[PDB]
Amino acid sequence: NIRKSHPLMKIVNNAFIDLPAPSNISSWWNFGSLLGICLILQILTGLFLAMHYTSDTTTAFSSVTHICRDVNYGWIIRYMHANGASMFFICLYMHVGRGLYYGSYTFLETWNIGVILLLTVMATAFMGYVLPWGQMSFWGATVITNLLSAIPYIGTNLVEWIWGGFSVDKATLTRFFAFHFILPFIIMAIAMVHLLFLHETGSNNPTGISSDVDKIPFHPYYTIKDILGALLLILALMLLVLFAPDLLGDPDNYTPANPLNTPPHIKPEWYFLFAYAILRSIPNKLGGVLALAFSILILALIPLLHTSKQRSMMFRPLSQCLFWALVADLLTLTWIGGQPVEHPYITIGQLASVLYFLLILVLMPTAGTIENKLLKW
Amino acid sequence: GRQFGHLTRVRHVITYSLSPFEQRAFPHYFSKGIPNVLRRTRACILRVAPPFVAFYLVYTWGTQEFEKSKRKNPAAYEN
Amino acid sequence: SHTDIKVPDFSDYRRPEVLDSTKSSKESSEARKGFSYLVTATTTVGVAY
Amino acid sequence: SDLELHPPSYPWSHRGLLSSLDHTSIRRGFQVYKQVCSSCHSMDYVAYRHLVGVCYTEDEAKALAEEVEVQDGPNEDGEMFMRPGKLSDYFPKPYPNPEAARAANNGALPPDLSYIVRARHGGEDYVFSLLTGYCEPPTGVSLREGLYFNPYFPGQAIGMAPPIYNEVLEFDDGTPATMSQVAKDVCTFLRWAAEPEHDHRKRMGLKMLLMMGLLLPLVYAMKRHKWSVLKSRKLAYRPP
Amino acid sequence: APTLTARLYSLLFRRTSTFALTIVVGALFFERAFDQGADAIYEHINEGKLWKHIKHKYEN
Numbered sequence: 001n002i003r004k005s006h007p008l009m010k011i012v013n014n015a016f017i018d019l020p021a022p023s024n025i026s027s028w029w030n031f032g033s034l035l036g037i038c039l040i041l042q043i044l045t046g047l048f049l050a051m052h053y054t055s056d057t058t059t060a061f062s063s064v065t066h067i068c069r070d071v072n073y074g075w076i077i078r079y080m081h082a083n084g085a086s087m088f089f090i091c092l093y094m095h096v097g098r099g100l101y102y103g104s105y106t107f108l109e110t111w112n113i114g115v116i117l118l119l120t121v122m123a124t125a126f127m128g129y130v131l132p133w134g135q136m137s138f139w140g141a142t143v144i145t146n147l148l149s150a151i152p153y154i155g156t157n158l159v160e161w162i163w164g165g166f167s168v169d170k171a172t173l174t175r176f177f178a179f180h181f182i183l184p185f186i187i188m189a190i191a192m193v194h195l196l197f198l199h200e201t202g203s204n205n206p207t208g209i210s211s212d213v214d215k216i217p218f219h220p221y222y223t224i225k226d227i228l229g230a231l232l233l234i235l236a237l238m239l240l241v242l243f244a245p246d247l248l249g250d251p252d253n254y255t256p257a258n259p260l261n262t263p264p265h266i267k268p269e270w271y272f273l274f275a276y277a278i279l280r281s282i283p284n285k286l287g288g289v290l291a292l293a294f295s296i297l298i299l300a301l302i303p304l305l306h307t308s309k310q311r312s313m314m315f316r317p318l319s320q321c322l323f324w325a326l327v328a329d330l331l332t333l334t335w336i337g338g339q340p341v342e343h344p345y346i347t348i349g350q351l352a353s354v355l356y357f358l359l360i361l362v363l364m365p366t367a368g369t370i371e372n373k374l375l376k377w
Numbered sequence: 378g379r380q381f382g383h384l385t386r387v388r389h390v391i392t393y394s395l396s397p398f399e400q401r402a403f404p405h406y407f408s409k410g411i412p413n414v415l416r417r418t419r420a421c422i423l424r425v426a427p428p429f430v431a432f433y434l435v436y437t438w439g440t441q442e443f444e445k446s447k448r449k450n451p452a453a454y455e456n
Numbered sequence: 457s458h459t460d461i462k463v464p465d466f467s468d469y470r471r472p473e474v475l476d477s478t479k480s481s482k483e484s485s486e487a488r489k490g491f492s493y494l495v496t497a498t499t500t501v502g503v504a505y
Numbered sequence: 506s507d508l509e510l511h512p513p514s515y516p517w518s519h520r521g522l523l524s525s526l527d528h529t530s531i532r533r534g535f536q537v538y539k540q541v542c543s544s545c546h547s548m549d550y551v552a553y554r555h556l557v558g559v560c561y562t563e564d565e566a567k568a569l570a571e572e573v574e575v576q577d578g579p580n581e582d583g584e585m586f587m588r589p590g591k592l593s594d595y596f597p598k599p600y601p602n603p604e605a606a607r608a609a610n611n612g613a614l615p616p617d618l619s620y621i622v623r624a625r626h627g628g629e630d631y632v633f634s635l636l637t638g639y640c641e642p643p644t645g646v647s648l649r650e651g652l653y654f655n656p657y658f659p660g661q662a663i664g665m666a667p668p669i670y671n672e673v674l675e676f677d678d679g680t681p682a683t684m685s686q687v688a689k690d691v692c693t694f695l696r697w698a699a700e701p702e703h704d705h706r707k708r709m710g711l712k713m714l715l716m717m718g719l720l721l722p723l724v725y726a727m728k729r730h731k732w733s734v735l736k737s738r739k740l741a742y743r744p745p
Numbered sequence: 746a747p748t749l750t751a752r753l754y755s756l757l758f759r760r761t762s763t764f765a766l767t768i769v770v771g772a773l774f775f776e777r778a779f780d781q782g783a784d785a786i787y788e789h790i791n792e793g794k795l796w797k798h799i800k801h802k803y804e805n
C-alpha cells in the first residue's frame with residue numbers, strides 16, 4: 001500500500017524512492033550518501049565508546065586503554081571510530097571536489113549549507129582528537145585553540161574563555177567531551193536541511209546540462225548503486241581497522257600528558273596538513289590565522305567567481321588542467337604541512353600557498369573567460 | 378520537490394528496452410570494457426597527469442635538498 | 457507508418473537461453489530467474505553473516 | 506644533537522598481513538621483563554590474567570603472580586599491609602612518585618611500559634635496534650658524564666645502561682639466552698603488551714577480505730542486473 | 746531433465762516465504778562452515794598459537 005499518502009513514508013518516498021534523479025550521475029555522486037553513512041558510523045561507535053570513556057584528566061588516557069584491552073571488542077569499535085573520522089574527511093574532500101569540478105556550487109543554498117557542514121565536522125573532529133589526552137591530542141589542542149588568541153583586542157579573553165582557565169586543562173577536556181557528543185546531532189539536522197534544499201532542484205550531473213528529459217527513479221537504480229558503494233566504503237574502512245590501525249595515527253598519542261614538554265616535531269592528523277602548511281607559510285601571527293581561515297572560508301566565494309557560460313568542466317579543457325593543478329597543489333600543501341619548517345620546505349610552502357589562492361581567485365575565473373571567447377559565446 | 382509527470386515536455390522519442398531477466402549483466406565485460414577504459418584514459422591524461430608529475434618532481438627534489446643541505450652536509454670547515 | 461517501427465536487435469545483450477526465436481522462452485524462465493535470485497539470496501546470506 | 510639513523514628490516518614472524526605471534530617467544534619475552542626490565546620500567550596496563558590467555562596457563566599465571574607483594578586494601582584499624590599476589594593486577598611498580606625513578610637513574614626517566622606503537626616510530630625495530638645496538642662513542646664527542654652512547658636514540662646520546670647479555674636465563678625449552686635471542690623475545694612480547702588484540706584482528710581481517718571477496722562481486726552483479734534495462738536501452742527520434 | 750537453478754527456483758525462490766526461509770537456513774550453515782573452514786586456514790598458516798604451546802602443560 002501507499003508510500004505516497006502516509007505523512008511519514010511520503011517523506012521517505014520523496015527522498016529515496018520516487019525522487020527523479022539523473023540517469024547519468026557518476027560514482028562521484030556516491031559520496032553524499034557515504035557522508036551519511038559516515039555520520040551514522042561515527043554516531044554508533046562514538047556512542048558505545050561513550051559507555052566506557054571517562055572525561056577526567058587523570059583517567060582519560062586510561063579509560064581509552066581500558067576499552068582497547070578490557071572491554072569486549074572495544075578495540076574494534078575504537079578503531080572504526082578513528083578510521084571512520086578519516087573516511088569522513090576523505091568523503092568531504094571528494095564531495096567538495098565533485099561540486100567544484102561539476103559546477104554543483106551553483107545550487108547556492110545547498111552549497112552554503114555544505115560549507116557549514118564542513119566547518120561543523122572539522123570542529124567536531126578537533127574536539128574528538130583531544131579526548132584521549134595524548135601528547136598530540138594535548139599539543140594539537142594547544143595549537144589550534146591559540147589561533148583564536150590572534151584576534152585583535154578580544155583574542156585572549158576568548159581563548160581563556162574557551163579554556164576555562166589559563167591553558168588547556170581539566171575544564172577543557174570535559175567541555176570538549178560534551179561539545180563533541182552534541183555536535184554530530186546538530187550536524188545531522190543541518191544535513192537534513194542540506195538534503196531539503198537539494199531536492200528543490202534535484203541533482204546536477206557530469207555534463208552540467210539539465211537532465212529533466214532523462215530522469216530515472218532513485219529506486220532500484222541509486223538504491224543499489226548506493227549499496228554497492230557503501231560496501232566499498234566499508235572495505236576501505238576495515239582494511240585500516242583490521243590491517244593498519246596505526247597508520248594515520250601518530251605514535252605520540254600513545255604517551256600521556258606533558259603540559260611541560262612539547263614533542264620535537266608535532267604533526268597534524270592528515271586532513272589538516274594542507275591548511276596547516278598555509279597557516280605556517282606566512283611568518284605572522286594574525287596573517288597566518290587569517291590565511292588559515294580564508295583557506296577554508298574561500299569555498300563560499302567560489303560561486304561569485306564562476307565565469308564560464310557552461311556549468312560543468314566536462315567540456316572545458318583549460319579549466320580541467322587548472323583544476324588538477326589545484327588538486328596537485330593541495331597534495332603539495334599536504335606533503336609540506338607534514339614537514340619541518342626549514343630550508344627547501346618553507347619556500348616550497350609559500351609558493352604553493354600563493355598558488356592555491358592565485359588559482360581560485362584569478363586563474364580559474366580567467367580560464368573560464370577565455371574558454372567562452374574561444375567558443376564565440 | 379519535483380515529480381515524474383511534471384518535469385518537462387518531450388515529444389517524439391521512442392525508448393526500447395529489455396527485461397533484466399532477459400539480458401546479460403556483463404555482456405562483453407572485457408572485450409568492450411578494456412578498450413573503453415583505454416579510450417577514457419587517453420581522453421583525460423593530458424589534463425589530469427601533468428600537475429601531478431609536477432608535484433612528483435618537486436617532491437623528490439624538495440626532500441633531496443633537505444637531506445643534503447642540513448644533515449649529510451657538514452661540508453668543509455678546514456684548518 | 458507506426459508500423460515502420462520495429463524493435464531493434466538485442467542479440468548482443470541477450471542471455472543465451474533466449475537469443476533463438478523459434479524457441480519459447482518460458483522454458484528458460486525458471487533457470488534465468490533461478491540464477492539471478494540465487495545471487496541475491498547468497499548476497500543477503502553473506503550480509504547476514 | 507639533531508642527526509640520526511633509522512631501524513633495519515623487521516623479519517619478525519608477525520610482520521605480514523595475517524601473522525600470529527610466536528606465543529612461545531611472548532613467554533621468553535615476559536621473562537625478560539620479569540627479571541631485567543621490571544626493576545626500572547613500570548608496565549602499568551598489563552595484568553597476570555592477561556597472560557592466561559597468551560603465554561601461560563591458569564595455574565601458572567597464579568603462581569607467577571604469587572612471587573610478589575602489593576599494597577592491599579585497608580582493614581578495621583585503617584591499615585595497609587601486603588599480600589601474596591593476586592592474578593588480577595600486574596603492576597610491580599618499581600617506583601612511587603615518578604620523580605623517584607629520576608633520583609635513582611640520575612635525571613633520565615625510564616619511560617613507558619607495554620612498548621612500541623608507543624612513541625616510537627618503527628616500533629619493535631627501533632627498540633630491538635636500540636637494545637641490540639650499543640656501540641663505541643666516536644672521536645670528537647664527549648659525554649657530559651659517562652651517560653651512555655647509542656647510535657639510534659634521538660641525539661645519539663643519553664640515559665640507559667646497556668642491559669642485554671648479562672645472560673639471565675630461565676627459558677625452559679632449551680633456548681640459549683643470547684644477546685639477540687633475548688631481544689627478539691623482549692620486543693616480541695612488548696608487541697603483545699602494546700597490542701593484545703593483534704592476532705584476533707588479523708583473523709577477523711582474513712574473514713573481511715574473504716567475505717568482501719564474496720559480497721563485492723555479488724552486489725556488483727545485483728546492480729548490473731537492475732541497471733541492464735538502462736545500459737542496453739535504445740533510442741529513436743521520430744519527429745513529424 | 747530440467748536444470749538445477751530451475752528446481753531451486755520452483756521449490757524455493759518463487760515465494761518470498763520460502764525465499765526468506767531458505768536464506769536464514771542458509772546463513773545458519775554458511776556461518777558455521779565459513780567460521781570453521783576459515784579458522785583452519787588461519788591456523789594452518791600460523792602455528793605459534795596458544796594451542797600447540799599448551800600441549801606442553803597438562804600438569805599444573
Ligand code: HEM
Pocket residue numbers: 537538541542544545546610613614615616620632635636658659663664665666668669691
Ligand atoms: C630490558 C630488556 C629493558 C628494555 C627492553 C628497555 C627498553 C627501553 C626503551 C625502549 C627505552 C626507550 C628509549 C626512548 O625513549 O627513545 C628505554 C629507556 C630508558 N631505560 Fe630502559 N629498558 C630495559 C631495562 C632498563 C633498565 C634495567 C634500566 C635501569 C638501569 C633502564 C633505564 C632506562 C632509562 C634511564 C631510560 C631513559 C632514556 C632517556 O630518555 O634518557 N632500562 N628503555
Ligand code: HEM
Pocket residue numbers: 042043044046047049050053064078081082084085086088121124125128129130131132180181182184185
Ligand atoms: C555520536 C557523537 C559522537 C560521540 C558520542 C563521540 C564519542 C567519542 C569519545 C567518547 C571519544 C574518546 C574515546 C577515543 O578516543 O576513542 C571520541 C574520540 C574521537 N571521535 Fe568521536 N564521537 C562522536 C561523533 C564524532 C564525529 C562526528 C567525529 C568526526 C568524524 C568523530 C571523530 C573522533 C575522533 C577523531 C576522535 C579521536 C579518536 C582517537 O584517536 O582516539 N567522533 N569520540
Ligand code: HEM
Pocket residue numbers: 028029030031032033035036039092095096099103104105107110111112113114115116117118187191194195198203204205299
Ligand atoms: C555532513 C556533510 C555532508 C553531507 C551529509 C552531505 C550529504 C549530501 C547528499 C546525500 C547529496 C545527494 C547526492 C550526492 O551524493 O551528491 C549531496 C549533494 C550535494 N552537497 Fe553535500 N553533503 C555534505 C557536505 C557537503 C559539503 C561540504 C558541501 C560543499 C561545501 C556540500 C554541497 C553539496 C552539493 C553542492 C551537492 C550538489 C549535488 C550535485 O551537484 O551533484 N555538501 N550532499
Ligand SMILES: C[C@@]1(c2ccc(Oc3ccccc3)cc2)OC(=O)N(Nc2ccccc2)C1=O
Pocket residue numbers: 122123125126127129130136137139140141143144266267268269270271272275276296
Ligand atoms: C585532528 C586534529 C585536527 C582536527 C580538525 C581540524 O580542523 C580543520 C581541518 C582542516 C582545515 C581546517 C580545520 C584540525 C586539526 O586535532 C588535533 O589536535 N590535531 N593535531 C594538531 C597537530 C599540530 C597542530 C595542530 C593540530 C589534528 O590534526
